[PDB]
């Protein structure tokens, strides 16, 4: 009923200090970088992704991390309109027919003070091979300091072109606004019979 995802809640690496965070791609995820917005050689000033600690006393959120200690974030330095980037993970599971997939991700708009107000917008995708089967493109209004849960669902029929191809997830910073950073957490993919 549940499909396994590595580091699904970005709990690895463990981070001790409040509001600390990494600037390396979270383990178990690759950087989705179709427009080359995330450079090969990262700096703390460049487009970046990583993991962050949302602990008691966080200046980023009114709540704690939706799950565990940690969230995964994407930050883009380029100006709005330059493209997208984010997290991708291809799974060791395949598109199977008469099956309904439910992808749930929590999407965070962190606030605080540089000022962190505003949002670049998000997209969450369910892949089979290279094909986006279903995606939530920025449908939820998320206020600074809050998380909302994005849901993407998909049902494959026996006649689907992409059966037995590898399932995948993308979590995308759209860069359609500033402050152009956002957080994700608690990735969940469950199957049930159609």
Contact 152, 134 (CB under 8 A): yes
Q: How far is the CB of 10 from a second copy (least distance, A)?
A: 24
The answer to whether residue 144 forms part of the interface with Ca ion (CB under 5 A) is yes
Identify which of 103, 145, 110 has the alpha carbon closest to the alpha carbon of residue 128. 103
Kindly indicate which of the ranges 2-10, 42-50, 127-135, 166-174 contains the residues binding Ca ion, using the contact rule CB under 5 A.
Answer: 2-10
Enumerate residues 3-22 that contact Ca ion by CB under 5 A.
9, 20
Region of 33-41, 55-63, 87-95, 156-164 interacting with a second copy (CB under 8 A):
156-164
Q: List the single partner that 155 binds among Ca ion, a second copy, none, CB under 5 to 8 Å by kind.
A: a second copy
- Report how far residue 150's alpha carbon sits from residue 187's, in angstroms, rounded to the nearest whole number: 10
Is 77 a binder of a second copy (CB under 8 A)?
no
The item of a second copy, Ca ion, none sharing an interface with residue 78, based on CB under 5 to 8 Å by kind, is none
Which residue, 89, 85, 73, is CA-closest to 3? 89
Give least dist CB 133 to a second copy, A.
Answer: 7
- How many chain residues interact with a second copy (CB under 8 A)? 32
Q: Which of 2, 15, 29, 14 is nearest to 184 (CA)?
A: 29
Question: Mapping DSSP to helix (H, G, I), strand (E, B) and coil, where does residue 72 land?
Answer: strand
141 near a second copy, rule: CB under 8 A: yes
Q: Is 150 helix (H, G, I), strand (E, B) or coil?
A: strand
């Amino acid at each position: 009923v549940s499909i396994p995802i590595n580091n699904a809640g970005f709990e690895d690496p463990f981070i001790e200090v409040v509001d600390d965070y990494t600037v390396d791609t979270p383990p178990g995820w690759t950087t989705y970088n179709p427009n080359n917005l995330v450079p090969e050689k990262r700096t703390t000033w460049t487009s970046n992704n990583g993991v962050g600690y949302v602990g008691p006393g966080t200046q980023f959120y009114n709540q704690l991390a939706p799950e565990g200690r940690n969230i995964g974030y994407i930050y883009l330095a380029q100006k709005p309109g330059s493209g997208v980037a984010g997290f991708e993970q291809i799974l060791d599971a395949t598109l199977e027919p008469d099956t309904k997939y439910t992808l749930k991700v929590d999407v965070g708009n962190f606030g605080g003070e540089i000022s962190l107000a505003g949002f670049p917008g998000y997209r969450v995708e369910l892949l089979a091979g290279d094909t986006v089967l279903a995606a939530d493109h920025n449908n939820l209004y998320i206020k600074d300091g809050e998380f909302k849960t994005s849901t993407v669902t998909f049902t494959a029929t026996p006649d689907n072109p992409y059966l037995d191809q590898k399932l995948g997830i993308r979590l995308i910073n759209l860069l359609q606004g500033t402050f152009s950073g956002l957080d994700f957490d608690n990735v969940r993919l469950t199957v049930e019979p159609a």
